[PDB]
Design a protein around this ligand. Structure first.
Ligand SMILES: Nc1nc2c(ncn2[C@@H]2O[C@H](COP(=O)(O)OP(=O)(O)OP(=O)(O)O)[C@@H](O)[C@H]2O)c(=O)[nH]1
Ligand SMILES: Nc1nc2c(ncn2[C@@H]2O[C@H](COP(=O)(O)OP(=O)(O)O)[C@@H](O)[C@H]2O)c(=O)[nH]1
Ligand SMILES: Nc1nc2c(ncn2[C@@H]2O[C@H](COP(=O)(O)OP(=O)(O)O)[C@@H](O)[C@H]2O)c(=O)[nH]1
Ligand SMILES: [Mg+2]
Lengths: 51, 46, 428, 372, 426, 427
């Protein structure tokens, strides 16, 4: 019981830590898509300068 | 330049004769005065 | 959470644990005064402020070599007691370290494991580095394998041991002390990976271009073979591997637990930008005797099992098209009773080069941990040197002097003979 | 004979290690040669090479040899140390608030004197760094106007390396007071330029020892240095100028006169850039479109740039068409009033590199000194 | 932490230890006024092995200095190193021994050991953990062989655990300096084999060679042959005193070298010897040191090693080094001259590595070795003895001071059966 | 796909064959540091011919750098493009390059030939289809004409189908700087006419006299002739890495060129060579280069055309030209010279027009002759051997190093088969 309780407590603490990091990673993937869209905006300015 | 010409001529500038050198001569060491204070160990320089 | 309490010992493990516990500083952000600038809690432990203090235990008997690490660059990182001192060296004998100078020091080292293991919520097993080549690693620690295994029961344990070399041999009396300590650990060490010193000094001259090497130049090539093994309990990847697989795939029998070791990409920094680091070229290098870290030839014997761990940008289709072309080589022979004979563990992390190293910044590593029956002829010479000395009863009288009997010379000879007729019953 | 040797430093791209070599130059025959101090064998053998110059043989100025970029770090020799470093001394100067609209003739006088300009950057300093300039000065006169000019008007800090730099700067500057200099009536930077005596001028250190204090006061180590000295936008933040190699050619003063002509302002100058990453960051729009992209990044690889933010002043002539067509020969076909026909020195790699689309000037300027 | 108790006796000893105790003053940066003025910080680390502490930062040694006459320790105080040696550690007699064994072993050196043993047992229990002992003494004289062999006998009776070492000054076999050398050297080596574990035999005929043909000095003293003997003393403990690649202590070369209780008579050496005038033409590297110390003309006893087979051969090294290049050199000297070792031991060579070379050197090494061609160091004394026992040449000195002839008769039955063990294996 | 494996043996071909790697790498746009440095995109997509790639996408060459002495591998690691080669397959040696054929083969060549084949294999067994072997040798000494034979006779046992086109400098008609020559050269022509499938020729004398008459140079060094040879070999290997309109690989040249098996030594060239002062007074057409192709004084060979009725002239054009202008002007030169082309072949010529000009000129080409005038270079060196053999004049060293007397008869007898089997089809 002592091993199970301590292990479950540390697992749930690191699981909520990974939960915060995973929601932050989803925001990070949205940020990477935002950087992809900004590269597309630079491609739009490249289209205008190409003209 | 008799027998033993070169070394006996050369050693005097770098260095009652028996009475003065009775304690010895600096044979097994370099002419330079100090090669101490080397912080040169394997687990110190590595 | 997935802690790995390692054990170094001897005059080996203090000159190994300066360069093996050097990369654990580097692969995480751990600066040499214990700070971040969490996959690191296998090897580090965090206080209130920031201080990541390590987990292993390093022992000697004389304090001449432990005194460097407390006065070198890495003092505030290491614990003020985890480095455990002594007063005098066992001085190349199995008598002193097993009964007299390893008996009066054993019950504070036993205290500090129990203090370190109980804080470890999720420890997996023990890793032992004892050198057969002297008096402490043979003596202090073969006392421990019958002392840890009594207290902590049925835990896994594995060794990365420093076997003395076949042609060069530093000390004189080692066909006693290498033979004697292997009789005791044969049923208390579930794996025994081995390396030599001549066998890596070949490799640092022909694969690297640096002649005139150092032990520290050799230690990082053992300091890199650990972290492609332990990394599957550390980092993310396709296939992670626990320490309950090394004793599983690689150990067929009770008394056959003696595999080999090889680490694939061994190329300098000057030649980094020329050769294509193809996954076949990294793979087919390991099966060659020139790359191999034990001075033995596998062409005289049969493989029995194998393993692999991979790093970095692995393309997992092409590894299976590189393992598959190994099977069309009749130079590489297998015994019939392991027709599968492999294991793959794949991580994401590419290897990290030390600042001031000899290996290049590479992206793909391969480490074999191969069982082979051509290690039995490495046991041939160390018995061949024994009775060629024991007949004259040379060098004996310090072994019986410090509280032993002569008669365990009569068994550690006779125990290896049954092992020497054990490995021919299995590769037949 | 009479070779000059140096220690060189190149960043290996594949295996990211910093590499140290020993380069050798042979004045009077044009040869170069390169051994390795790290490993004693010879990789690069002896060669002749034409583009390298004895004025390019200065510690720090980063020169390309055979498409490799290296900064000369050390003096490996006592001979070349005696031959060059005993004479090459540094002097500090600073364009004050009044001299921004008259800097072209002063910079032409400096280029006629022959001092090599290492760093000439506009700066707006912090509170402590601003007060450290005025901490040393104490006398009878009331310096309220000069103090308000320093704390309010923008300035630029510059370093000039020359043979007897302090002596040549003193002989070019002359008398201190403006009325006294005009009464003496010699041709001088203080007599012809500068306003109201102690109100504003180009800064000049009193002694070689005090030049260290003056340089530490005006431009210290970059803790509180201040990245910007100009407004980020003024609703027309759309003109970027840059001078990578024509500063080494020396026509920076003359092109400042021609841009002061026709009533165009100049806002902010600075001289820090990394050869590749910073330029890549803002040549990004240029990446897909422009051809000869290798050459157009190579002649920015070549040298540092005095790069300058500028706004649109009149709508009668656009600044882009004042800058001219993309080729100097096309400029000489069309009109001599184009800046390529006056100054352009390469086929497409023009003397002034600008932006084409008017939108991205604000973002490029905010990158170039607000971020950097 | 592991100190060294040093013993001295005779006037032969106390010129050598006076030269031994100045290279320790050189390497630890000790000035001759008791303080320390060395520029390092590793030299001050294990200072305690040879330098006890006092007030004012003074460092004064663990030294014992003994003779039966006052005429020798007047000069040791009157040397260049007077203030360092302890005034309570000059134990003195009044009458010289005069080339006789029982003058020091049974009568006049025997009444005085109760004042030496007071000095040692007080001092040796001030060490926190002693490693062992060392002696430099005269087998040729009457005090070192007479009195000092009691101190090897009686101190070993107190503590049997520690290690006895001997920088024996054994007589030359060719030119002799005393007509009772085949008694004082014969009888002294009757008690060395039950009592002493390391025995370094030193000859002056072997050392008059080296300071002429190798160092090129036409006028050699003792004080410039004492320094090479004083080189190899601090050249043994190079690894206990300092950090490095592979440390080794004085139990670690008394295990690698002596396979039997009675085959323990070593053979000393020193590696880097070249002229004073031509010092800067050689290249002091790894092949230069090994090519000298594996030869007969770099050997500190006067027996040619080529007439027998070494059982075991030790070494030690010093200075920053590349360990594979020594490992190539140690197999070559086991593969090339395989007829100069016995075939019934697999490994015969040991090495150990320090880190800091001496003051003025870069690469140093010291040669210690068991060899069975040390019989010619003992058969010449053992054949000198019976050519004068049969004529009873000097027995009236020995009988009239408390001896027998049965203490004489058994002192060659030891000396014959010693050689009657070495003979079979070569 | 399509590739050529390379080696660089002898001193003479090591300097020329490493002068090759700049005339290649500037056309295709590689910096010396291994990065791509090209202007156009079209010359990157056939880089797998000469070049293997490296991690990071930088580019290394297929070459092998082996000769007896380490003097010249310290000369081809040199200033322009030394960094690109692989440092593992650099090969050196110990013993002297003492111009002996047993030093070519029997004494020094034995220890390397285990290693210096495994530099062909490690760059060929990692491939798809092999098409050419390019080896830059000479014909004078035991350095270059004892290793040029050695590194191709071994290979033919295992790579037998493919084509092996070397490039070799032949002896000059006036003065040679080696005196020991036809013991080796006639002993090397015993294998080169057998094993190889095409084998070129270059005089040193004609290479100087282009520079005085047409170029009007004052001072031709040895840096000039490198360029004049390296441009010809880098123009005949272009329909295998360029777009074009009439395209031929190296095995088209097996069936186009040689009618009887042992006649494959060709005569190089390069058309639009001119001076500096005469550029504005010269015009560039397809007829105006065609004269300069068929100029008697633009070849690399000293042989006059009057002894030569050309068998198969192949002028590989390279530029933006017209296919009729090529075809009408490769025939209008032929009716005008009836007696100097063979009557038993109806079309004696062959073109190839491509799409990428050289760097620098808008249009160029490459003459390749195949003449019946090359018996004059055959009558020279076979005549040097007969007087020197009856003296046994320098045979003491080769017999001392191990070459028997009865083989020097045999080598000249089979060098006599390169005029006798030539004389049947001369007439
Ligand atoms: N290659 C290599 N070998 C090492 C290293 N450290 C120790 N060794 C080897 O370890 C052996 C040294 O003996 P010890 O480590 O002192 O053996 P021990 O168990 O400590 O026995 P004692 O000295 O009596 O305490 C030698 O064979 C060395 O070659 C190392 O860092 N690299
Ligand atoms: N090389 C050398 N030999 C010495 C020294 N001192 C004494 N001897 C030798 O010692 C022998 C004499 O010893 P002795 O004085 O009778 O011993 P003691 O009476 O016990 O002091 C002589 O044969 C000397 O050659 C020394 O400092 N150096
Ligand atoms: N392009 C070029 N050719 C050279 C150079 N040096 C020598 N040669 C040629 O090499 C020839 C030397 O004969 P060679 O066959 O090479 O002798 P070998 O090296 O012993 O085989 C000379 O006739 C030159 O024409 C050089 O630097 N550049
Ligand atoms: Mg130890």
């Amino acid at each position: 019981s002592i091993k199970s309780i301590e292990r479950d407590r540390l697992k749930t603490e690191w699981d909520q830590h990974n939960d915060c990091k995973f929601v932050d990673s989803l925001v990070k993937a949205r940020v990477k898509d935002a950087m992809q869209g900004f590269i597309i905006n630079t491609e739009e300015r490249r289209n205008k300068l190409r003209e | 330049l008799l027998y033993n010409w070169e070394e006996e001529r050369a050693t005097n500038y770098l260095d009652s004769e028996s009475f003065f050198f009775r304690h010895g001569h600096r044979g097994l060491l370099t002419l330079q005065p100090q090669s101490p204070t080397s912080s040169c160990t394997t687990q110190k320089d590595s | 959470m997935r802690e790995c309490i390692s054990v170094h010992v001897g005059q080996a493990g203090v000159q190994i644990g300066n360069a093996c516990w050097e990369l654990y500083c580097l692969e995480h952000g751990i600066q040499p005064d214990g700070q971040m600038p969490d996959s690191f809690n296998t090897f580090f432990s965090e206080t209130g402020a920031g201080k990541h203090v390590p987990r292993a235990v390093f022992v000697d008997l004389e304090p001449t070599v432990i005194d460097e690490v407390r006065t070198g660059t890495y003092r505030q990182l290491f614990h003020p007691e985890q480095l455990i001192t002594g007063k005098e060296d066992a001085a190349n004998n199995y008598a002193r370290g097993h009964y007299t100078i390893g008996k009066e020091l054993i019950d504070l080292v036993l205290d500090r494991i129990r203090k370190l293991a109980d804080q470890c919520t999720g420890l997996q097993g023990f890793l032992i580095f004892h050198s057969f080549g002297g008096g402490t690693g043979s003596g202090f620690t073969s006392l421990l394998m019958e002392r840890l295994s009594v207290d902590y029961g049925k835990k896994s344990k594995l060794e990365f041991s420093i076997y003395p070399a076949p042609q060069v041999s530093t000390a004189v009396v080692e066909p006693y002390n290498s033979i004697l300590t292997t009789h005791t650990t044969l049923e208390h060490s579930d794996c025994a990976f081995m390396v030599d010193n001549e066998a890596i000094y070949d490799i640092c001259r022909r694969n690297l271009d640096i002649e005139r090497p150092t032990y520290t130049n050799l230690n990082r090539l053992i300091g890199q073979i650990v972290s492609s093994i332990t990394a599957s309990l550390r980092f993310d990847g396709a296939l992670n591997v626990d320490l309950t697989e090394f004793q599983t795939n690689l150990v067929p029998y009770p008394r056959i637990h003696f595999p080999l070791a090889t680490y694939a990409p061994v190329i300098s920094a000057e030649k980094a930008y020329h050769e294509q680091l193809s996954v076949a070229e990294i793979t087919n290098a390991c099966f060659e005797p020139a790359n191999q870290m034990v001075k033995c030839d596998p062409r005289h014997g049969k493989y029995m099992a194998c393993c692999l761990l991979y790093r970095g940008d692995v393309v997992p289709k092409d590894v299976n098209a590189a393992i598959a072309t190994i099977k069309t080589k009749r130079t590489i022979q297998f015994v019939d009773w392991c027709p599968t004979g492999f294991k793959v563990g794949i991580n994401y992390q590419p290897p990290t080069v030390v600042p001031g190293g000899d290996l290049a910044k590479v992206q793909r590593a391969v480490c074999m941990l191969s069982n082979t029956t051509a290690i039995a002829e490495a046991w041939a010479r160390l018995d061949h040197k024994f009775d060629l000395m024991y007949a004259k009863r040379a060098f004996v009288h310090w072994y019986v002097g410090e509280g032993m009997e002569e008669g365990e010379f009569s068994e550690a000879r006779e125990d290896m003979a049954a092992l020497e007729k054990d490995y021919e019953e299995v590769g037949m | 004979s009479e070779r000059f040797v140096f220690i060189a430093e190149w960043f290996d791209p594949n295996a990211s290690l910093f590499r140290r070599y020993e380069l050798l130059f042979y004045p009077g025959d044009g040869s170069v040669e390169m051994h390795d101090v790290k490993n004693h064998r010879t990789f690069l053998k002896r060669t002749k090479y034409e583009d390298l110059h004895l004025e390019d043989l200065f510690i720090g100025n980063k020169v390309n040899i055979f498409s490799r970029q290296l900064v000369l770090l050390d003096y490996g020799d006592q001979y070349t140390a005696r031959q060059l470093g005993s004479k090459k001394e540094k002097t500090l100067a600073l364009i004050k608030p009044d001299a921004v609209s008259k800097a072209g003739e002063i910079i032409e006088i400096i280029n006629k004197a022959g001092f090599t300009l290492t760093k000439l950057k506009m700066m707006t300093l912090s509170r402590k760094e601003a007060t450290d300039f005025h901490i040393d000065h104490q006398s009878r006169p009331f310096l309220n106007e000069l103090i308000q000019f320093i704390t309010s008007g923008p300035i630029i800090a510059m370093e000039i390396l020359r043979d007897d730099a302090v002596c040549e700067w003193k002989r070019l500057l002359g008398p201190a007071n403006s009325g006294l200099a005009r009464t003496d009536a010699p041709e001088s930077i203080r007599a012809l330029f500068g306003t109201d005596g102690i109100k504003n001028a180009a800064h000049g250190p009193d002694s070689f020892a005090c030049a260290a204090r003056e340089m530490e006061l005006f431009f210290p180590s970059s803790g509180v240095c201040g990245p910007a000295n100009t407004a980020k936008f003024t609703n027309c933040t759309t003109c970027c100028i840059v001078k990578p190699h024509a500063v080494s050619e020396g026509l920076l003063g003359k092109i400042l006169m021609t841009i002061r002509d026709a009533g165009f302002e100049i806002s902010a100058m600075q001289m820090f850039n990394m050869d590749r990453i910073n330029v890549e960051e803002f040549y990004e729009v240029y990446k897909g479109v422009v051809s000869e992209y290798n050459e157009m990044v190579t002649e920015m690889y070549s040298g540092p740039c005095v790069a300058m933010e500028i706004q649109q002043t009149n709508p009668t002539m656009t600044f882009r068409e004042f800058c001219g067509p993309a080729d100097p020969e096309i400029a000489r076909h069309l009109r001599p009033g184009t800046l390529r026909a006056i100054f352009g020195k390469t086929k497409i790699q023009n003397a002034v590199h600008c932006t084409d689309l008017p939108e991205d000037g604000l973002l490029e300027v905010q990158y170039f000194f607000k971020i950097l | 932490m592991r100190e060294i108790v040093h013993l001295q006796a005779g006037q032969c000893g106390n010129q050598i230890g006076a030269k031994f105790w100045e290279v320790i003053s050189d390497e630890h940066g000790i000035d001759p006024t008791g303080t320390y003025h060395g520029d390092s910080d590793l030299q001050l680390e294990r200072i305690n092995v040879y330098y006890n502490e006092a007030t004012g930062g003074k460092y004064v040694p663990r030294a014992v200095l003994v003779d039966l006459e006052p005429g020798t320790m007047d000069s040791v105080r009157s040397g260049p190193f007077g203030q360092i040696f302890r005034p309570d550690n000059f134990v003195f007699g009044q009458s010289g021994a005069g080339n006789n064994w029982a003058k020091g072993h049974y009568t006049e050196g025997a009444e005085l050991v109760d004042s030496v043993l007071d000095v040692v047992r007080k001092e040796a229990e001030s060490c926190d953990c002693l490693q062992g002992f060392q002696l430099t003494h005269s087998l040729g004289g009457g005090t070192g062989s007479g009195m000092g062999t009691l101190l090897i006998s009686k101190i070993r009776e107190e503590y049997p655990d520690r290690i006895m070492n001997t920088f024996s000054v054994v007589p030359s076999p060719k030119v002799s300096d005393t007509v009772v050398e085949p008694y004082n050297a014969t009888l002294s080596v009757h008690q060395l084999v039950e009592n002493t574990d390391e025995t370094y035999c030193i000859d002056n005929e072997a050392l008059y060679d080296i300071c002429f043909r190798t160092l090129k000095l036409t006028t050699p003293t003792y004080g410039d042959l004492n320094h090479l003997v004083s080189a190899t003393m601090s050249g043994v403990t190079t690894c206990l005193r300092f950090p490095g690649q592979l440390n080794a202590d004085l139990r670690k070369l008394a295990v690698n070298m002596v396979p039997f209780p009675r085959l323990h008579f070593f053979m000393p050496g020193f590696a880097p010897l070249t002229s004073r005038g031509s010092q800067q033409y050689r290249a002091l590297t790894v092949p230069e040191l090994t090519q000298q110390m594996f030869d007969a003309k770099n050997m500190m006893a006067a027996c040619d090693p080529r007439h027998g087979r070494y059982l075991t051969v030790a070494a030690v090294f010093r200075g920053r080094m590349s360990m594979k290049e020594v490992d190539e050199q140690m197999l070559n000297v086991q593969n090339k001259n395989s007829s100069y070792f016995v075939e019934w031991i697999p490994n015969n060579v040991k090495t150990a590595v320090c880190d800091i070379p001496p003051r003025g050197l870069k690469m140093s090494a010291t040669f210690i070795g068991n060899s069975t061609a040390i019989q010619e160091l003992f058969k010449r004394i053992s054949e000198q003895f019976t050519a004068m026992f049969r004529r009873k040449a000097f027995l009236h000195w020995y009988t009239g001071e408390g001896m027998d002839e049965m203490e004489f008769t058994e002192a060659e039955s030891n000396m014959n059966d010693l050689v009657s063990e070495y003979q079979q294996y070569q």
